[PDB]
Amino acid sequence: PVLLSLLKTSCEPYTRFIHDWVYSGVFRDAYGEFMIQVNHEYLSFRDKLYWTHGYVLISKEVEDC
Amino acid sequence: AGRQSRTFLVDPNLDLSIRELVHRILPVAASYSAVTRFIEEKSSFEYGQVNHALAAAMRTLVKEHLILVSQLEQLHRQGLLSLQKLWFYIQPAMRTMDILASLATSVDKGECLGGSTLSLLHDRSFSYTGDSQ
Amino acid sequence: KKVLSTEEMELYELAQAAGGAIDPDVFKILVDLLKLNVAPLAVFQMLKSMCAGQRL
Amino acid sequence: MSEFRIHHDVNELLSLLRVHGGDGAEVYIDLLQKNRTPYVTTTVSAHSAKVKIAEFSRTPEDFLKKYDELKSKNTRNLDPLVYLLSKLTEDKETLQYLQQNAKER
Amino acid sequence: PESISSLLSEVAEYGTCYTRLSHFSLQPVLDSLYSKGLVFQAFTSGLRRYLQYYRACVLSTPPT
Amino acid sequence: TLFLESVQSRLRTPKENLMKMQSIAESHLELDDVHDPLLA
Numbered sequence: 001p002v003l004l005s006l007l008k009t010s011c012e013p014y015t016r017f018i019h020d021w022v023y024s025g026v027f028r029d030a031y032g033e034f035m036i037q038v039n040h041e042y043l044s045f046r047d048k049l050y051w052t053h054g055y056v057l058i059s060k061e062v063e064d065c
Numbered sequence: 066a067g068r069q070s071r072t073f074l075v076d077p078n079l080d081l082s083i084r085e086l087v088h089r090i091l092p093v094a095a096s097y098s099a100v101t102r103f104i105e106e107k108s109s110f111e112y113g114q115v116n117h118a119l120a121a122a123m124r125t126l127v128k129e130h131l132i133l134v135s136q137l138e139q140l141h142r143q144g145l146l147s148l149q150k151l152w153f154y155i156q157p158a159m160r161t162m163d164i165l166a167s168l169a170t171s172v173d174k175g176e177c178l179g180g181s182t183l184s185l186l187h188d189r190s191f192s193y194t195g196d197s198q
Numbered sequence: 199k200k201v202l203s204t205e206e207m208e209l210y211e212l213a214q215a216a217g218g219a220i221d222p223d224v225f226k227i228l229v230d231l232l233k234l235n236v237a238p239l240a241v242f243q244m245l246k247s248m249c250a251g252q253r254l
Numbered sequence: 255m256s257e258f259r260i261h262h263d264v265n266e267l268l269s270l271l272r273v274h275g276g277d278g279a280e281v282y283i284d285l286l287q288k289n290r291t292p293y294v295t296t297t298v299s300a301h302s303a304k305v306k307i308a309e310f311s312r313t314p315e316d317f318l319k320k321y322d323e324l325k326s327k328n329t330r331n332l333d334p335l336v337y338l339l340s341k342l343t344e345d346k347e348t349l350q351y352l353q354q355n356a357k358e359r
Numbered sequence: 360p361e362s363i364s365s366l367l368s369e370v371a372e373y374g375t376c377y378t379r380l381s382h383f384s385l386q387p388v389l390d391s392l393y394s395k396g397l398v399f400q401a402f403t404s405g406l407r408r409y410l411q412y413y414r415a416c417v418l419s420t421p422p423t
Numbered sequence: 424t425l426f427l428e429s430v431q432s433r434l435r436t437p438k439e440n441l442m443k444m445q446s447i448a449e450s451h452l453e454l455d456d457v458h459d460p461l462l463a
Contacts, residue, residue, distance in 0.1 A: 001460075001461030001462065002409065002459075002461060002462045004461050005405065005459045005461040005462045006402055006405045006406065006409075009195075009401050009402065009404065009405035010398040010399065010401045010402035010405065011398065011401075012194075012195055012401055013194050013195045013397035013398055013400070013401050014397065014398045016194050017397075026295075026297060027297050027299075028297055029297075029299050030297075030299050030300065030301050030396070030397055031299055031301035031302055031394065031395070031396030031397060031398075032299035032301065032302030032303075032396075033299075033396045033397075033398060037299075038296055038297070039239045040237035040238070040239055040240075040289070040291065040295065040296035041237040041238075041239035041240035041242075041243060041289040042239070042289070043237070043291075043295075043296070044237060044240075044288060044289045044290070044291050045288070045289070149418050150418075153411075153414070153415065153418070153451075153452075153453045154453055154454075156411065156453050156455075156456070157453060157454075157455035157456075167388075170326065171326050171327075171328065174326050174327045175326070175327045175328040175329075177328060181328065184328065185328045188328065192389070194397070195389075195397060195400065195401040195404060196404070198455070205329055205330065208320070208323075208324060208329065209324070209329070209331070209332070209335050211320065212316075212317065212320040212321065212324065212332075212335070212336075213335065213339055215311060215313040215316035215317045215320055216307045216310065216311040216313075216317045216336075216339045216343075217310060217311045217312040217313070217343075218339055218342065218343075218349075219353060219356055220352065220356060221270070221355075221356045221359050223266075223270065224267070224270055224352075224356070224359075227263050227266055227267055227270070228335075228338065229331060229335070230259070230263055231260075231263055231286070232331040232334045232335065232338070233330075233331065234255070234259070234260060234290060235290060235291055235292055235293065235294055236286050236289065236290045237289045237290065237291060237296060238296070238298070238334045238337045238338050238341065239289070239341070240285055240286050240288075240289030240290070241286065241338060242338060242341035242342070242345070243285065244282050244285060244286055245342070245345075245348060245352075246345055246348050247282065247285075248267065248268070248271050248273055248282070249271065249345075249347070249348040249351040249352060250347075250348070251273065251274075252271065252272060252273065252351055252355070254350065254351060254354055300391065301391070301393065301394050301396060302394075304391065304392070304394065305394045308394075318391075318392040318394075319392065321391050321392065322390050322391040322392045324391075325390075325391040326391075405459075408456060408459070408462075409462060411452070411453070411456060412448075412452065412456075412462065415448065415451040415452045415453075416451065418451055419447060419450065419451035
């Protein structure tokens with residue numbers, strides 16, 4: 001039960017980051033813990049490259065990200 | 066010494082455990098002293114209305130702290146305050162004063178004024194996403 | 199160092215502690231580009247394009 | 255700031271980097287402006303960027319301490335600068351070229 | 360004294376665990392140099408709460 | 424068991440813990456620290 005409580009408490013900032021990512025597409029990961037990174041140079045793009053490179057989910061280590 | 070937090074000297078002949086508990090509680094007094102210096106400095110008109118309002122809001126929490134400390138003094142006069150009880154009861158006050166001292170230090174180091182103060186306050190509020198208090 | 203502002207000087211000292219020996223004028227211009235809210239990934243790509251042609 | 259400040263800054267950067275020919279300055283300007291957002295919308299994970307620079311920095315403790323100092327001062331562009339340094343540390347060739355230009359300069 | 364020393368050694372091991380765990384969890388502030396991230400910082404806050412509960416339990420133990 | 428019971432009869436022969444923990448916490452925990460029920 002204590003481990004569950006600690007997991008919840010540690011996920012709370014991560015769950016806030018997830019909420020912001022899901023609702024606003026805002027990556028709120030301050031330490032790079034979320035699987036998605038935003039490359040703002042392509043996020044400003046107005047083409048397919050905006051979607052593919054502006055925000056990039058770290059796919060190779062999906063288990064780690 | 067300068068814009069540093071107030072440091073305290075404890076009598077060396079005190080019990081090591083007592084002296085260490087005093088040094089654990091003294092951070093509250095160091096934070097209070099830092100907050101009071103920040104409040105007294107940033108309450109100057111030259112610091113702008115946002116910093117004046119911030120100093121007044123901090124002054125309200127310092128007043129609540131003085132109420133708390135007066136309650137701990139009253140309990141001590143009643144003999145109900147042990148060093149371990151003080152340490153437990155001051156944990157929230159220690160955390161609050163540490164947060165206030167961190168904010169005071171950040172405002173003073175950044176010379177934040179107007180929109181920069183609001184930006185700093187927003188970034189601090191986001192930084193406390195895990196601490197509801 | 200007089201080319202960099204005190205904040206830019208502190209960033210230059212940080213960059214030196216980061217191991218970057220950057221020219222203060224280059225760092226100043228980079229800070230000005232960052233002040234224009236240009237995305238750092240685009241600035242990095244620009245630097246890479248500018249440097250790639252200059253063979254040592 | 256002047257509307258064309260980016261053109262002056264780019265021209266100075268081209269001169270300082272000894273880039274032969276202003277042919278393509280418009281392309282670098284267009285890349286930066288197309289990727290220039292008026293709002294700092296990029297929430298850069300400064301913690302991980304700090305970590306990458308500290309792994310890259312010869313003085314990683316000093317880098318982390320300076321980052322926490324600048325954050326306590328709310329220093330503008332701190333996280334963008336740390337990200338730029340991390341990207342330069344990622345591009346060893348670009349970093350060596352920049353070091354050689356700095357030495358020559 | 361040997362048996363008492365053994366018992367006291369076990370109690371000292373428990374106290375050692377308490378003090379070392381408190382020190383490990385005492386990493387307080389997720390400052391800009393905190394590289395363990397906000398999930399780890401929140402975990403350490405929860406751990407501080409746990410150690411506070413442990414201290415409260417120890418203080419609740421009557422000395423009789 | 425049935426034999427013993429019948430023989431004796433004929434011969435006339437022969438959350439609350441959570442609440443306790445909450446009270447203990449209130450007596451020993453600082454007022455402001457939320458009790459964690461799994462941790463509690």
